[PDB]
Amino acid sequence: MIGLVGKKVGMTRIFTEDGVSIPVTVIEVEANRVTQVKDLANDGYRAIQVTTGAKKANRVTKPEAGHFAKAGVEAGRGLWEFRLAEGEEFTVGQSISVELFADVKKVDVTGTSKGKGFAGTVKRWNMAGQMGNERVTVQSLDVVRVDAERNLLLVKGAVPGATGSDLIVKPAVKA
Amino acid sequence: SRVAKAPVVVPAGVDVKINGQVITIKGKNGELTRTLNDAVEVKHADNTLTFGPRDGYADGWAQAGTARALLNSMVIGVTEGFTKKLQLVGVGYRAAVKGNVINLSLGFSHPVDHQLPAGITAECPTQTEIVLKGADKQVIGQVAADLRAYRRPEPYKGKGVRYADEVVRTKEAKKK
Amino acid sequence: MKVRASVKKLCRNCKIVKRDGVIRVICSAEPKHKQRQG
Amino acid sequence: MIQEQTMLNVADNSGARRVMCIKVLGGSHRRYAGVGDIIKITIKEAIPRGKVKKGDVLKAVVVRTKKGVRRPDGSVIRFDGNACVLLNNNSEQPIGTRIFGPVTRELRSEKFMKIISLAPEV
RNA sequence: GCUGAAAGCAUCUAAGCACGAAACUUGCCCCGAGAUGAGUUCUCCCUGACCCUUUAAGGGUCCUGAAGGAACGUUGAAGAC
RNA sequence: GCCAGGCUGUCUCCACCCGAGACUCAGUGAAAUUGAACUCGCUGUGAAGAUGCAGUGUACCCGCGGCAAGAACAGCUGAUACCGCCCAAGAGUUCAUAUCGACGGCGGUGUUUGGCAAUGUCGGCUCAUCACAUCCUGGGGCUGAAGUAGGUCCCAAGGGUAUGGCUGUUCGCCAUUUAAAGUGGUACGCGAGCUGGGUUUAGAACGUCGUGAGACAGUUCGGUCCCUAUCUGCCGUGGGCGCUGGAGAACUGAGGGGGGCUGCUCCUAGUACGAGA
RNA sequence: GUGAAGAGGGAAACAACCCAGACCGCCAGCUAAGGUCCCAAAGUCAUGGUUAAGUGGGAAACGAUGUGGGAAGGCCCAGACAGCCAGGAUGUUGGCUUAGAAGCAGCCAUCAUUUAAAGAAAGCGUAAUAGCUCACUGGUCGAGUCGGCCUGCGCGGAAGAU
């Protein structure tokens, strides 16, 4: 349906009752309120613009400050878009929590891999060029635990990006 | 040519509308439309449908006969119901029919369902052998094509007997 | 099936059909006599 | 972990002392084999009189691995070396009725139901 | 392949007229409006004056210097620069 | 002169760390080459692979770090030889083409033998591109298909299409796996990319020819593997400009990047039924 | 003859293919080969025919069944071609190699009554039976139909170059 943007914190192991160690990646998912709504009539497609974080007033460009003021919400650290699946729509300022992912069991994570210097031909292809800092998606990941009251998200395996890197989690298209 | 030079009697209760190339046939069974080829200028000719090809077409006579044949068929169908039609089905394995779905087990490990194209006078007089009817007129387009494509009582073993009421062939079996 | 240049009626039950610009021979008795390229 | 031309120990009373690996099976274009995988090995030393003779080439399975294997809880089983027991294509029941050292719990395969009984030391 | 004549039998087709191979393309992921055809949407900022000429996509003068960027410092899991 | 054993990243696979260069700042600074350049890909022709000739398509202008894709060997003809086809005697339990198919004719090839008269040449490594005229994943037709397996034909290039001993070897034989371990063009691809295993730049060595320098598809050793790759092409990233008052963000999207592999078992299931097998 | 030692135009490029021998200058007109959809200048020009396949816009020898036509030939309202609501009855379960070939394997005749009409027999399937068709014969509609030659082109042949 619709995904949310979060911040990567770290990854560790979670022990099940039966005694199985499972890797989990920690994602802090703040309530991503909606700033603008795009529709077929005006914008040509259905979408919603979500924002997260918090920027200082002195560190926010006046155009961005006005844009956030129009939506009547505090200025975030960035804006992201998610295409609707012809389902229920949303309204400006509608905060979205992690409760949506509490009943999905399958999520896909997109983000920017850690930047690296030039990698030789053998190192890259196994042509040589800079690696990292490009969008990459890993799909078909299962959410282990969800903490709504703490804005926490755990998924199995590893996700692109280092500590503090922003990532996007969306419902698993494949199934 | 020979088919074209054959006026087709249209009995009472059948309405024929000739909107240029468009041919509309109505009757007891229901509505029926068929856009005819532009090479034929068939005259309405109440109580008949005399066909005369338009000048300037080499394919005029064959097109006129092609029209005549199925125009007569459609007329005597809308008056009685697809004179020129049948069907064939009761499909030789564990199966059933309900609503607009014929559920089947044609030699597969999973059921195969053929969608009934919005209208069918389904029946099951006997278990499994070839038969069916005319009432469905235009909705009978193929229908049995999916039934035979999945399996056509393989013409070696006869593993599962034919269809609704009549017969089908087979010859000798080794492996099941 | 046969794809020879020349197609002829091997038996009585052979019919010549021009399909997609190709002259084929269709036999209702034995499929073996079916040849594609005319 | 076992690779091509790897030294394996002996964990049976068949009389073998040193066995060498010649080919690796269990997967097309496979470079490594696991503990629960079949390998092709030969014999370097044999007892004076016995069923096993020098030069024989036959299947075998690794019971203990120097690299070790992982566990769902994070535990790891590690040994001082690699131990392998010879297996035959026909009559899979190995001649050796006694196995030196312990064994892991991954021998619950269909073909390894007769070996769990042996190796009393776990 | 349901009906099926032309050509009282028949036929994949002439006509009412549907399935179907992983073959093909979408669908699955990423770059992409320098796409000069230079795309769509939101927001923010400027609301002065005078003179001259070859009198109009004109020029110059005094004041003004908006948002934003760049300039420099700490630097980074970004980086040859 | 030989054997057995211990012994290291030579490799499966490379992983990480310390110095000197590679990159930037401040100054010194020369050459090989140079007719002039506003120095694109493909098709066609050309003293015969065209950045410069005809056609077609793409590309805003200028920089930076990069992998290096840029007589002997390689003109006219085709008897010879190979390839595909047509007819077709016959084999096939009767039935020429399910499968082979004798005697014949027809065309294409420059893949052998042939006839006329400073372009560094066979291999192995890296790197690949393209047609199917398909080895496989294959489906679809015929079957002498009472079946998987299969015997033969239409299409499919989307993808895959080995390891070791004899050769320098192309090729071929052998053993083990796989789904197969494909056919060919790319100067019988690729030496201003990597080594030269014999041949075939320069040296010298042995036998022969000539008094002589020298020569030998007679045979070993090693063999600058020459050319500041200026420049052509491509990955990445920057400086300027335009999108028409200026600016910060979020994106639709014309097009473009590459992958569509697969073994075993399970329940289905000793299932369809089949005289049984 | 050309180039050598002749420029220029056409054949998309091109020196041996076609037209054509440059004294100089003109923003004049008429021609040769070649063109008159555009690129790029000229007829989307008139009449008579071929073409349904982009063959034109690449191909030989050799073999047929498409239209346009020619010579014609056979059967045809005492009604032809395709047709079939109707018939295909009886010994000929045959002697013969009796294992059953009975027409559907062969030695064999290849006869004979009903006859508006039927053969001691052409296909499908049965161990052979049996059974369904076709040769011909009754009835309606019915007018044309069938096999080869000549050919210009459509065709095979035919598979051509990142």
Numbering used by the authors:
A (entry chain D): 1 to 126, 161 to 209
B (entry chain G): 1 to 176
C (entry chain 4): 1 to 38
D (entry chain K): 1 to 122
Share the article's original sentences.
The proline-rich antimicrobial designer peptide Api137 inhibits protein expression in bacteria by binding simultaneously to the ribosomal polypeptide exit tunnel and the release factor (RF), depleting the cellular RF pool and leading to ribosomal arrest at stop codons. Separation of cellular extracts derived from cells exposed to Api137 in a sucrose gradient reveals elevated levels of partially assembled and not fully matured precursors of the 50S subunit (pre-50S). High-resolution structures obtained by cryogenic electron microscopy demonstrate that a large proportion of pre-50S states are missing up to five proteins (uL22, bL32, uL29, bL23, and uL16) and have misfolded helices in 23S rRNA domain IV. These data suggest a second mechanism for Api137, wherein it disrupts 50S subunit assembly by inducing the formation of misfolded precursor particles potentially incapable of evolving into active ribosomes, suggesting a bactericidal mechanism.
Importantly, the absence of uL22 was consistently observed in most identified precursors (states: 1-8), implying a systematic effect of Api137 on ribosome assembly. Quantification of uL22 and uL29 incorporation revealed a frequent absence of uL22, observed in ~46.4% of all precursors. The absence of uL22 and bL32 in several states of the Api137 dataset also led to the absence of uL2 in eight precursor states (states 1-8), suggesting a possible role of uL2 as a checkpoint protein, whose binding completes a construction phase.
